[PDB]
Amino acid sequence: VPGFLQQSQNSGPGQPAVWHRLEELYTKKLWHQLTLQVLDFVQDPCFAQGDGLIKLYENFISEFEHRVNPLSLVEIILHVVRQMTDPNVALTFLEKTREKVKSSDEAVILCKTAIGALKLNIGDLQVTKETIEDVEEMLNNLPGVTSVHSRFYDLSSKYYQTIGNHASYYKDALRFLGCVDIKDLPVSEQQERAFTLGLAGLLGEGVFNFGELLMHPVLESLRNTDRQWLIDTLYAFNSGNVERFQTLKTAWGQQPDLAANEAQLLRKIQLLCLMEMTFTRPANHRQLTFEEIAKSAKITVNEVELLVMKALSVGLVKGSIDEVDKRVHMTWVQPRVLDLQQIKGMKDRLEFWCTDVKSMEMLVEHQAHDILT
Amino acid sequence: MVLESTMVCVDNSEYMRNGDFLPTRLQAQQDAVNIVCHSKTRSNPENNVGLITLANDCEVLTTLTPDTGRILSKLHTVQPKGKITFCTGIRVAHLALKHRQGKNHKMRIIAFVGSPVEDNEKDLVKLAKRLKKEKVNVDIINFGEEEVNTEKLTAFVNTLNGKDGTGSHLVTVPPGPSLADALISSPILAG
Amino acid sequence: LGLPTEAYISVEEVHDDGTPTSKTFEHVTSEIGAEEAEEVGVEHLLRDIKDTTVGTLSQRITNQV
């Protein structure tokens, strides 16, 4: 047992000192107090090349261990697989670990996520889709652990970007933010993951709510002055500004993956222009004429008809079309966010309404005094 | 005897499952209770025992009950997982005494401390402060090889017994595989 | 003036806005019932006030006001 440390004790400054402490913990037969420091043993190697040989020591203990916490065990195994890098047997290794961990709190979830990572740069049709859907064990989630939630969503965070559907990426990549992430990640990464998420926003088929992403407390705050075109464009979509979008194309950063979809992008903002145009109008008028819509979205008069139907088809506005006087009625524009001033105005409409209902109460109570009690 | 009611405070922390005594500190705990609950009974043929977990939050298994087998059977399926919240642990046992059977039973709770204890003093004095106000003496038994002598409870137990308040005492065990056995004798003997 | 019986049921859904652990109650409409045996006692126990001649008088007061 002690022989291994002899050849492994010459690995850096202070290395042999750590083992001597480690040996005593083994003698006492406890494992957890020996379990936490191993995590300190993964970041120790600058190259982390020889740390993969500790398997012989773990092999005896880990084979019939059933005493070390599997969550730590999957963490411990997953760290060793990092430098091992011969996947053929790692899967057997990774499958080997999976068969030995079935605790009440599923640690296989972390093991399954490790499976996909081993399949990272290979397969896109059914290589991982089979695993990820199966990985959805979260029924009986008992949320709060969330240790594996970050890993699962990250793994899913990479599938949908390798399949090209920039809609599920937003749906899941958002789930990662707000998980155990607790932000405070590498600032470069923080800005790195805001760009990727933001672009996914204005590239999807159902992502029309650019009111939460624009005010997302996490992502859109590590980008104030490094590349503001993405934040400016997000304000462009939330305001339904086609003019402010056609004059910013010249400032489109990372043109690939966003320049290819030049018509999908224009059909997204174009739809929102008819949206944050019904909102502005008071409910009384709401008589958007055909010309008044084409001008504000940069369409010809003979084409606005397909725009209104597109908005109604998705379910985002409600109304009817009258192609006799060239009018479009709107009755319900999907609610959006109001920061702090349109909410004060909402207070006014309740004061002017509570006082009106108040008056009609005493009117009946006073002229119906006999009929009461 | 003396119509006593004890409310056992079991431990199930994740680092509590290492077998530095013999059959891991899970059977070591189960044998420990057996030698107390039965010892707790057999003196007055009307006693009462209740096991409470010190897991992440309020986890109570069996309430005030004269039976003896329920606690033992309920001890199983108690596989340790998580941290220990001592400060908010005794109070949960504290309420159990308040809502007891016929109140003519003397109230005491024996602690089953273990995997690394967490406390900030000061508050612990308040924790011991209240219990010492209301006809309550606690029995924290040092176990699981916490910091030597556990010089955080030391400021705790003395508060209850302070001012010549003879009662329960702190009991420690050698870090070596010292079998639990009848080693627990300070409270049972006369306290 | 309102009914003193609010009945809530537990409904689960986790989101990224509130907290990682999301579980909130959803309201179910509740009204005061009556069984044949209970109604006999309940009305006997009151003998205090009743909307006698339940017509246009009770409606103008029991639902409108």
Contacts of A146 in chain C (CB under 8 A): 20
Structure tokens of B70? 């329920």
Residue type, B152: K
Report DSSP state, residue B183: G
Bridge partners (DSSP) of residue A322 are: A327
Q: Nearest CA to A208 among A144, A253, A142, A275?
A: A275
CA distance B56 to A144: 12
Bridge partners (DSSP) of residue C10 are: C25
How many contacts does A have with C, using Cβ atoms within 8 A?
36
A353 Cβ contact partners less than 8 Å away, ≥ 6 residues apart:
none
- DSSP, collapsed to helix, strand or coil, labels residue B17 as helix
CA distance C11 to chain A (A): 14
Q: For residue B17, give the nearest of A67, A104, A105 by CB distance.
A: A67
- Residue showing tokens 């194309």: A249
B152 Cβ contact partners less than 8 Å away, ≥ 6 residues apart:
B117, B119, B121, B124
- DSSP, collapsed to helix, strand or coil, labels residue C64 as helix
- Side-chain half-sphere CA neighbours of A372 within 13 A: 9
Q: Nearest CA to A333 among A256, A285, A277, A373?
A: A277
CA distance A102 to A141: 16
b/e map B61-97, b = 16+ CB within 10 Å: bbebeeeeebbbeebeebebbbebbbeebbebbbebb
CA dihedral A336, A338, A344, A346 (to 10 degrees): 0
Task: Give chain A's length.
Answer: 373
* CB neighbours of residue A293 within 10 Å: 22
Residue type, C13: E
Are the C-beta atoms of A106 and A134 separated by less than 8 Å? no
Bridge partners (DSSP) of residue C27 are: C8
What are φ and ψ of residue A349, in 5° steps? -65, -20
Are the C-beta atoms of B48 and B5 separated by less than 8 Å? yes
Report DSSP state, residue B138: E
CB contact under 8 A, C20 and A141: no
Structure tokens of A83? 């430098």
A105 interfacial to chain B (CB closer than 8 Å): yes
CA distance A89 to A85: 9
In Å, how far are A20, A64, B26, B34, B108 from B19, measured between CA atoms?
Answer: 21, 15, 8, 18, 29
CB contact under 8 A, A67 and B20: no
Q: What is the 3-state secondary structure (H, E, C) of B94-128?
A: HHHHHCCCCCCCEEEEEECCCCCCCCCCCHHHHHH
Q: For residue A32, give the nearest of B14, B79, B175 by CB distance.
A: B14
- DSSP, collapsed to helix, strand or coil, labels residue B171 as strand
Our answer on whether C and B touch (3+ beta-carbon pairs < 8 Å) is no
CA distance B135 to B64: 18
A234 Cβ contact partners less than 8 Å away, ≥ 6 residues apart:
A198, A201, A202, A210, A213, A214, A220
Nearest residue on chain A to B174, alpha-carbon basis: A28
CA dihedral A226, A228, A234, A238 (to 10 degrees): 130
Are the C-beta atoms of B186 and B171 separated by less than 8 Å? yes
CB contact under 8 A, C16 and A179: yes
With vertex at residue A116, the alpha carbon angle to CA A111 and CA A117, rounded to the nearest 5 degrees, is 90
- Residue showing tokens 């009305």: C43
CB contact under 8 A, A31 and B18: yes
H or E, element range at B10 = strand B9-10
Nearest residue on chain C to A216, alpha-carbon basis: C17
Resolution (A): 2.9
Bridge partners (DSSP) of residue C28 are: C7
Our answer on whether B and A touch (3+ beta-carbon pairs < 8 Å) is yes
H or E, element range at C8 = strand C7-12
Task: Give chain C's length.
Answer: 65
Are the C-beta atoms of B35 and B181 separated by less than 8 Å? yes
With vertex at residue A99, the alpha carbon angle to CA A95 and CA A103, rounded to the nearest 5 degrees, is 130
Contacts of C61 in chain A (CB under 8 A): 368, 371-373
- DSSP, collapsed to helix, strand or coil, labels residue B186 as helix
* CB neighbours of residue A13 within 10 Å: 6
Q: What is the 3-state secondary structure (H, E, C) of chain A?
A: CCHHHHHHCCCCCCHHHHHHHHHHHHHCCCCHHHCHHHHHHHCCCCCCCHHHHHHHHHHHHHHCCCCCCHHHHHHHHHHHHHHHCCHHHHHHHHHHHHHCCCCCCCCHHHHHHHHHHHCCCCCCCCCCHHHHHHHCCCCCCCCCCCHHHHHHHHHHHHHHHHHCCCCHHHHHHHHHCCCCCCCCCCHHHHHHHHHHHHHHHCCCCCCCCCCCCCCCCCHHHCCCCCCCHHHHHHHHHHCCCCHHHHCCHHHCCCCCCCCCCHHHHHHHHHHHHHHHHHCCCCCCCCCCEHHHHHHHHCCCHHHHHHHHHHHHHHCCEEEEEECCCCEEEEEEECCCCCCCCHHHHHHHHHHHHHHHHHHHHHHHHHHCCCCCC
CB contact under 8 A, A368 and C60: yes
CA distance A290 to B123: 72
Beta strand B52-53 pairing with A317-322: unpaired
Structure tokens of A285? 């008028």
